[PDB]
From TrEMBL, chain A:
It comes from the Eukaryota. This is Eukaryotic translation initiation factor 3 subunit E. Belongs to the eIF-3 subunit E family. GO terms for cellular component: cytosol; eukaryotic 43S preinitiation complex; eukaryotic 48S preinitiation complex; eukaryotic translation initiation factor 3 complex, eIF3e; PML body; postsynaptic density. One of its GO terms (molecular function) is translation initiation factor activity. GO terms for biological process: formation of cytoplasmic translation initiation complex; nuclear-transcribed mRNA catabolic process, nonsense-mediated decay; positive regulation of translation. It is found in: Cytoplasm; Nucleus; Nucleus, PML body. Signal peptide: none annotated. CDD domains: eIF3E. Residues 6-192 are annotated as: Sufficient for interaction with TRIM27. It comes from Oryctolagus cuniculus.
Automatic annotation (TrEMBL), chain B:
Component of the eukaryotic translation initiation factor 3 (eIF-3) complex, which is composed of 13 subunits: EIF3A, EIF3B, EIF3C, EIF3D, EIF3E, EIF3F, EIF3G, EIF3H, EIF3I, EIF3J, EIF3K, EIF3L and EIF3M. The eIF-3 complex appears to include 3 stable modules: module A is composed of EIF3A, EIF3B, EIF3G and EIF3I; module B is composed of EIF3F, EIF3H, and EIF3M; and module C is composed of EIF3C, EIF3D, EIF3E, EIF3K and EIF3L. EIF3C of module C binds EIF3B of module A and EIF3H of module B, thereby linking the three modules. EIF3J is a labile subunit that binds to the eIF-3 complex via EIF3B. The keyword Transmembrane helix does not apply. This is Eukaryotic translation initiation factor 3 subunit L. Residues 151-357 form the PCI domain. It is found in: Cytoplasm. GO terms for cellular component: eukaryotic 43S preinitiation complex; eukaryotic 48S preinitiation complex; eukaryotic translation initiation factor 3 complex; fibrillar center; nucleoplasm; synapse. The chain holds residues 224 to 595 of 607 of the full protein. One of its GO terms (molecular function) is translation initiation factor activity. GO terms for biological process: formation of cytoplasmic translation initiation complex; viral translational termination-reinitiation. Transmembrane segments: none annotated. It comes from Oryctolagus cuniculus. Keywords: Cytoplasm, Initiation factor, Protein biosynthesis. Belongs to the eIF-3 subunit L family.
UniProtKB/TrEMBL annotation, chain D:
It comes from Oryctolagus cuniculus. This is Eukaryotic translation initiation factor 3 subunit K. Component of the eukaryotic translation initiation factor 3 (eIF-3) complex, which is composed of 13 subunits: EIF3A, EIF3B, EIF3C, EIF3D, EIF3E, EIF3F, EIF3G, EIF3H, EIF3I, EIF3J, EIF3K, EIF3L and EIF3M. The eIF-3 complex appears to include 3 stable modules: module A is composed of EIF3A, EIF3B, EIF3G and EIF3I; module B is composed of EIF3F, EIF3H, and EIF3M; and module C is composed of EIF3C, EIF3D, EIF3E, EIF3K and EIF3L. EIF3C of module C binds EIF3B of module A and EIF3H of module B, thereby linking the three modules. EIF3J is a labile subunit that binds to the eIF-3 complex via EIF3B. The chain holds residues 110 to 216 of 218 of the full protein. Component of the eukaryotic translation initiation factor 3 (eIF-3) complex, which is required for several steps in the initiation of protein synthesis. The eIF-3 complex associates with the 40S ribosome and facilitates the recruitment of eIF-1, eIF-1A, eIF-2:GTP:methionyl-tRNAi and eIF-5 to form the 43S pre-initiation complex (43S PIC). The eIF-3 complex stimulates mRNA recruitment to the 43S PIC and scanning of the mRNA for AUG recognition. It is found in: Nucleus; Cytoplasm. The gene is EIF3K.
From TrEMBL, chain F:
Residues 1-46 are annotated as: Disordered. Component of the eukaryotic translation initiation factor 3 (eIF-3) complex, which is required for several steps in the initiation of protein synthesis. The eIF-3 complex associates with the 40S ribosome and facilitates the recruitment of eIF-1, eIF-1A, eIF-2:GTP:methionyl-tRNAi and eIF-5 to form the 43S pre-initiation complex (43S PIC). The eIF-3 complex stimulates mRNA recruitment to the 43S PIC and scanning of the mRNA for AUG recognition. Component of the eukaryotic translation initiation factor 3 (eIF-3) complex, which is composed of 13 subunits: EIF3A, EIF3B, EIF3C, EIF3D, EIF3E, EIF3F, EIF3G, EIF3H, EIF3I, EIF3J, EIF3K, EIF3L and EIF3M. The eIF-3 complex appears to include 3 stable modules: module A is composed of EIF3A, EIF3B, EIF3G and EIF3I; module B is composed of EIF3F, EIF3H, and EIF3M; and module C is composed of EIF3C, EIF3D, EIF3E, EIF3K and EIF3L. EIF3C of module C binds EIF3B of module A and EIF3H of module B, thereby linking the three modules. EIF3J is a labile subunit that binds to the eIF-3 complex via EIF3B. Belongs to the eIF-3 subunit H family. It is found in: Cytoplasm. This is Eukaryotic translation initiation factor 3 subunit H. Residues 6-25 have a biased composition (Low complexity). It comes from the Eukaryota.
């Protein structure tokens, strides 16, 4: 793109907080885990995706990341280390600091009430300066941070603070599982990145990565935000023109949000502009699932397709990333290919179909009869065999032109006939 | 006040002329003979008849839909205004057809199908396209009211075609040219929802600009949404009855919405269960004679899984789109699958296309007349 | 350039003479070829353009067995073959694309003569395995506006069509629709 | 009108003497039940036809069996209509049109 | 067909049938599912099925339908089965010879009235029309 | 169609542009004669009613209609003869 002549000088030097280290030396399947090598960097700390991992396969490598956070609550970190039976003798600095925060707080908490009480701007803005200073120090006063950014988000340096603060809030309130407060930053961060301060390529790209995470936890059916992320900026597989960015799930969850909520007539716009472009060419070399999902599909394979599609669904059910719609993908991954395979077909067996997807032929029959009920194919079952038949040759296209080509001219000659 | 200065001056001028129309048509042949001679157009004498069809219906619909009690409008017009003009010895020329179509237009505001055949018997004089299109207009609406969907859909197709071998210039169907477009569009859209397995014959009847939108309407209606029950019924009502003017919309007078309770809620009962007949036919008959695999595959579609079963299937088969056998020892369901034919449009076009040649060869031989 | 053109433009022009002719666009090789194609003296080929013309005539007749010398021997004679270590990849791609399109430049013309097909005879005629041939015919019938129907699990294909004289119906259809949709421009100039 | 004939005879209240007071009404609706059965069915069960007509006895059904010339099949159902006589489907390529199409194209 | 027509390779004989049909020397359903070739009895018969340039095949085409095939045979072959064998037509055509003879017998009397008029007109036509 | 195209573009579509450039010229000037307006407004060489097609070409529309009539008619006689000869 036109920004990418600029991105090509900077060569992937993004403003990460954790400095490239992760839960390293992993055992199990990698394109699932590799997302915590781009998130847990561009998206700062991503600690719910540490707690998720142990439940499928035990680690003690979540522990070094679990030492190093304070805005969730300081002492929750101070326990997980003790639980791993670690001497960590010199924890004398967070008890020093986070205590003396209560002494500092009794000023701002007093000033805060008295100002919003009076309705007096000056006493509220000097508070907002004292209080936007403070609410990055500890987040356990969650109601105080919530009350702070409620009335005024315009602080003494406006957009600079507001961005790192609404981002620090969108980050911390997902870690509190305060999804309603994170849904407040869903409104406010997406405007703050669009009304941009400087548009420097080091931050412009990172701000477009931050557009993922408010859609991602699925407490209140947020994936409808597919319709937002296609309108807010132009279409891209990754919203970063630096190809060194890689999210697998952004396209899997886009594929879920297209099919499971809207009509399949809407999916070949994606198959062009999001499944073939220059970023996605690098992506097609790498991810197994999302490759099988579309490359096998668009080639109109059926044999390797509906087998390796059915194989993806073993790796899908291994997902402990929080979503509501993991199974409506498993549903539609069988539906969508079947319609397209049978589209030009002669005669498919319900029995061959049922051997493949590991269902009984009765299920496959009522499934096919429901695909025909839904009128996604015009077909008819050879009931004796348990085979299903499409057979439109549709000869004689001549008549399609013949009515209108005269009905046009007979009513359009009326124009020149008038005067 | 300017409202009812115009309205009252129409009716009082029509009640004046109603005496002249009874006086001329019956007996005074020298007065009719004197009226044949003087002008260059007898069209001025003819147009005033069916000009007052739609204008008087407007003025009487206002008075009807303002006075809902102690009825002055409907018995005055029904007794004097209509039957005096039409019942008696008719005018000695085509003018007798024009008052017949005017009376048919008045008869059709009473929701009925009986006298259409007795009116057709009295349409002795030849069916000129000007009279014939307006006959098929209300005769098709009578077949629509008669539940002859298979008949009425054929009758709406011809009158919407707009290749009917007339130039139709000089205001003969004025102020309402697109009412003939949109009413035939609308009333045909209701019929297709019932019987879409016979009509391959759709393509000449409605144009692809409208077939695309009305096509998806029928599917969206019967299958998955009762939304189209609303928007179809919104457009269908002003066209099914033809109430020429709705009165001034204000809350200070009531007076108007009270007759619209009955007029609307009468058509509610029509589209109600006639639409719910459609969804049964919507799932196409995939296998023509159904064994246990397909009968049970369709009982699942008939309605919900319950301790009472087959009886609703046995009910739904009694309507005009199913004919069947049940064999008890086999336990078998045998059924009719039915269609028409694709290759009929062309041989109806073979004359219509020759009219595009004819009128082409003719009109430029009227220009070849002038500039020569 | 000319082999990248040939391995699209010949199945594309075979579709155009199957009356899919509305996809024709100017500056394509058909105008450039005409200055040689108008000459009667077309003996055995002795230049790289003439070897492309001979490969083009064989491919415009649906033949990949004659084209073995145009893929290999004439590229060695022109000293073009030796110039890449990727020539072993190009040989495979040429063979596979030539098998796909020597099928299709047969299909687009033989569509008036077909009725049903054995997929085993396709794997013997065009070398490609049945898993691959299953995709190849599907990619045609989904896109290229032909009237066939496909039976991958029973190794079978169908067409059942009628009227081989359809070229007059289709040429007059084009002659008449480029009447009625061209005719309206004169009215838009007049208003 | 929805042809729910089993629900029709269930729905009846028998204390409304006006519905007894219409002469031939109780048989007229039964004659309309059997009228639609002839148009829409080929075979019907003896118990099924009874139930549609208000749960008739063996002797009461003898009237309705004789009315349209119906009879009992071998150890089983009543015969209502022959299979080919019920359906009467419409046709493709009838193509009688040449007896008028040639005459308009005559000149 | 392999037992009726020996060739260099049987797979290449079924190819040769495809190849000749694609070259428009004939038109046939080779490449088929049951390995049955169909030539067709008529079908939508068209000149691709024969050589139009003269006949390269021997002069034994079978019967096929085309425009006026029935009609013109109905004129001539039904008349030839009267003109060739008949006892009847010799009397009818002798009566037609008598009509031809009567036309000439009547009109060659009028040649005396045509001759002198056409002779003087034809002598004068250059003198007059120039 | 391409003859009619180019002449109807001289008839209307060029006069359309020249009418706007006349409006940019304000249709003439005080100080000097209207030379640039007069250099815009020159009659284009193809008139209304280009004569060769409208006469001699149209004598051949009549011949084309009569070749279509002649080819049709023999076909009509077979369509009667064929069905009816076999109908016995």
């Amino acid at each position: 793109y036109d920004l990418t002549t600029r991105i090509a000088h900077f060569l992937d030097r993004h403003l990460v907080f954790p400095l490239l280290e992760f839960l390293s030396v992993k055992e199990i399947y990698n394109e699932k885990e590799l997302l915590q090598g781009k998130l847990d960097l561009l998206s700062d700390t991503n600690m719910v995706d540490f707690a998720m991992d142990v439940y499928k396969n035990l680690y003690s490598d979540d522990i070094p990341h679990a030492l190093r956070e304070k805005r969730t609550t300081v002492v929750a970190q101070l326990k997980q280390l003790q639980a791993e039976t670690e001497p960590i003798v010199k924890m004398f600095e967070d008890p020093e600091t986070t205590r003396q925060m209560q002494s500092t707080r009794d000023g701002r908490m007093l000033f805060d009430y008295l100002a919003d009480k009076h309705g007096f701007r000056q006493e509220y803005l000097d508070t907002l300066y004292r209080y936007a200073k403070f609410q990055y120090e500890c987040g356990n006063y969650s109601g105080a941070a919530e009350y702070l950014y409620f009335f005024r988000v315009l602080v003494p340096a406006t957009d600079r603070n507001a961005l790192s603060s609404l981002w620090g809030k969108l980050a911390s309130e997902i870690l509190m599982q305060n999804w309603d407060a994170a849904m407040e930053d869903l409104t406010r961060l997406k405007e703050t990145i669009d009304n941009n301060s400087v548009s420097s390529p080091l931050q412009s790209l990172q701000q477009r990565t931050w557009l993922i995470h408010w859609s991602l936890f699925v407490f209140f059916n947020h994936p409808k935000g597919r319709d937002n992320i296609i309108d807010l900026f132009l279409y891209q597989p990754q919203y970063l023109n630096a190809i060194q960015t890689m999210c697998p799930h952004i396209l899997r969850y886009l594929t879920t949000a297209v099919i499971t909520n809207k009509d399949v007539r809407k999916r070949r716009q994606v198959l062009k502009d999001l499944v073939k472009v220059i970023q996605q060419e690098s992506y097609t070399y790498k991810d197994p699932i999302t490759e099988f999902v579309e490359c096998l599909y668009v080639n109109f394979d059926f044999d390797g397709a509906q087998k390796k599609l059915r194989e993806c669904e073993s790796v899908l059910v291994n997902d402990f990333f929080l979503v509501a719609c993991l199974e409506d993908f498993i549903e539609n991954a069988r539906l969508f290919i079947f319609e397209t395979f049978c589209r030009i077909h002669q005669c498919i067996s319900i029995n061959m179909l049922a051997d493949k997807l590991n269902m009984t032929p009765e299920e496959a029959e009522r499934w096919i009869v429901n695909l025909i009920r839904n009128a996604r194919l015009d077909a008819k079952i050879d009931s004796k065999l348990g085979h299903v038949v499409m057979g439109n040759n549709a000869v004689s296209p001549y008549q399609q032109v013949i009515e209108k080509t005269k009905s046009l001219s007979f009513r359009s000659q009326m124009l020149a006939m008038n005067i | 006040q300017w409202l009812w200065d115009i309205i009252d001056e129409f009716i009082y001028q029509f009640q004046s002329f109603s005496q002249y129309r009874c006086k001329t048509a019956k007996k005074s042949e020298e007065e009719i003979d004197f009226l044949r001679s003087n002008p260059k157009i007898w069209n001025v004498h003819s147009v005033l008849n069916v000009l007052h069809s739609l204008v008087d219906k407007s003025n009487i619909n206002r008075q009807l839909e303002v006075y809902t009690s102690g009825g002055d409008p409907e018995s005055v017009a029904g007794e004097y205004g209509r039957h005096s003009l039409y019942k008696m010895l008719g005018y000695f020329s085509l003018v007798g057809l024009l008052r017949l179509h005017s009376l048919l237009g008045d008869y059709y505001q009473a929701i009925k199908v009986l006298e259409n055949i007795e009116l057709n018997k009295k349409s002795m004089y030849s069916r000129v396209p000007e009279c014939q299109v307006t006959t098929y207009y209300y005769v098709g609406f009578a077949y629509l009211m008669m539940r002859r969907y298979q008949d009425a859909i054929r009758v709406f197709a011809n009158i919407l075609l707009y290749i009917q071998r007339t130039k139709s210039m000089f205001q003969r169907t004025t102020y309402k040219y697109e009412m003939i477009n949109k009413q035939n569009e609308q009333m045909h859209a209701l019929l297709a929802i019932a019987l879409t397995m016979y009509p391959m014959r759709i393509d000449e009847s409605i144009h692809l600009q409208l077939r695309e939108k009305y096509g998806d309407k029928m599917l969206r209606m019967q299958k998955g949404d009762p939304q189209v029950y609303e928007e179809l019924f919104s457009y269908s009502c002003p066209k099914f009855l033809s109430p020429v003017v709705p009165n001034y919309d204000s809350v200070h007078p009531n007076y108007h919405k009270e007759p619209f309770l009955q007029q609307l809620k009468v058509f509610s009962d029509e589209v109600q269960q006639q639409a719910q007949l459609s969804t049964i036919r919507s799932f196409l008959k995939l296998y023509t004679t159904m064994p246990v695999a397909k009968l049970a595959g369709f009982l699942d579609l008939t309605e919900q899984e319950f301790r009472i079963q087959l009886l609703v299937f046995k009910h739904k088969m009694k309507n005009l789109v199913w004919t069947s056998g049940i064999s008890a020892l086999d336990g078998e369901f045998q059924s009719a699958s039915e269609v028409d034919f694709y290759i009929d449009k062309d041989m109806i076009h073979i004359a219509d296309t020759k009219v595009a040649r004819r009128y082409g060869d003719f009109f430029i031989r009227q220009i070849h007349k002038f500039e020569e | 350039y000319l082999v990248s053109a040939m391995l699209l433009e010949i199945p594309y022009m075979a579709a155009h003479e199957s009356d899919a002719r509305r996809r024709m666009i100017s500056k394509q090789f058909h105008h450039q070829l005409r200055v040689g194609e108008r000459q009667p003296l077309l003996g055995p080929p002795e230049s790289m353009r003439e070897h492309v013309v001979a490969a083009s005539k064989a491919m415009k007749m649906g033949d990949w067995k004659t084209c073995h010398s145009f893929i290999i021997n004439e590229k060695m004679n022109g000293k073009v073959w030796d110039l890449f270590p990727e020539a072993d990849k190009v040989r495979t791609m040429l063979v596979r694309k030539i098998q796909e399109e020597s099928l299709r430049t047969y299909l687009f013309t033989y569509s008036s003569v077909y009725d049903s097909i054995s997929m085993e005879t396709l794997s013997d005629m065009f070398e490609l395995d049945l898993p691959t041939v299953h995709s190849i015919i599907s990619k045609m019938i989904i896109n290229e506006e032909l009237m066939a129907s496909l039976d991958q699990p029973t190794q079978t294909v169908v067409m059942h069509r009628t009227e081989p004289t359809a070229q007059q119906n289709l040429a007059l259809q084009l002659a008449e629709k480029l009447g009625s949709l061209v005719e309206n421009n004169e009215r838009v100039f007049d208003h | 009108e929805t042809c729910h004939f089993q629900a029709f005879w269930q729905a009846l209240d028998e204390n409304m003497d006006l519905l007894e007071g219409i002469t031939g009404f109780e048989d007229s609706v039964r004659k309309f039940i059997c009228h639609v059965v002839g148009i829409t069915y080929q075979h019907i069960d003896r118990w099924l036809l009874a139930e549609m007509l208000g749960d008739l006895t063996d002797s009461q059904l003898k009237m309705w069996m004789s009315k349209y010339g119906w009879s009992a099949d071998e150890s089983g159902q009543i015969f209502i209509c022959s299979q080919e006589e019920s359906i009467k489907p419409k046709n493709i390529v009838e193509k009688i049109d040449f007896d008028s199409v040639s005459s308009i194209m005559a000149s | 067909l392999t037992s009726l027509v020996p060739f260099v390779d049987a797979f290449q004989l079924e190819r040769a049938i495809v190849d000749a049909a694609r070259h428009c020397d004939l038109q046939v359903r080779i490449d088929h599912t049951s390995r049955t070739l169909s030539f067709g009895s008529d079908l939508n018969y068209a000149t691709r099925e024969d050589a139009p340039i003269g006949p390269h095949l021997q002069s034994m085409p079978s019967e096929q339908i085309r425009n006026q095939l029935t009609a013109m045979s109905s004129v001539l072959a039904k008349a030839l089965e009267v003109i060739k064998p008949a006892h009847i037509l010799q009397e009818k055509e002798e009566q037609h010879q008598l009509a031809v003879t009567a036309y000439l017998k009547n009109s060659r009397k009028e040649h005396q009235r045509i001759l002198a008029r056409r002779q003087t007109i034809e002598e004068r036509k250059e003198r007059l029309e120039s | 169609r391409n003859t009619s195209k180019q002449q109807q573009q001289k008839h209307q579509y060029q006069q359309r542009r020249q009418q706007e450039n006349m409006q940019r010229q304000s249709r003439g000037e005080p100080p000097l004669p209207e030379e640039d307006l007069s250099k815009l407004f020159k009659p284009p060489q193809p008139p209304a009613r280009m004569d060769s097609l409208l006469i001699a070409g149209q004598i051949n529309t009549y011949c084309q209609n009569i070749k279509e009539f002649t080819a049709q008619n023999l076909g009509k006689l077979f369509m009667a003869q064929a069905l009816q000869e076999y109908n016995n």
